[PDB]
Amino acid sequence: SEAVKKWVNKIIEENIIAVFAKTECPYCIKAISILKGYNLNSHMHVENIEKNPDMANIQAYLKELTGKSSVPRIFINKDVVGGCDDLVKENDEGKLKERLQKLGLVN
Secondary structure, three states: OHHHHHHHHHHHHHOOEEEEEOOOOHHHHHHHHHHHOOOOHHHEEEEEOOOOOOHHHHHHHHHHHHOOOOOOEEEEOOEEEEOHHHHHHHHHOOHHHHHHHHOOOOO
């Protein structure tokens, strides 16, 4: 489905912070909360891929793009961050704040 790919791509391109998630997902919630802690809301979009008829195609494409089909899947300016553990590593090690500084999202 070129349509599935185009829809996912549009989500990743039109939003600097893009998070694919699902219903009742503790690590989705944690990742999203961490990102909102940097006051990124205005440039963040969260898509619930579970409430979607094409979840399997979406997940397969996210795997093609990032290496894993699990949620959360996190992109920042089209760059793959990965999952919540990846985000936590970047945050703890200073990489996340660096990313956001380069994009003018934090001072």
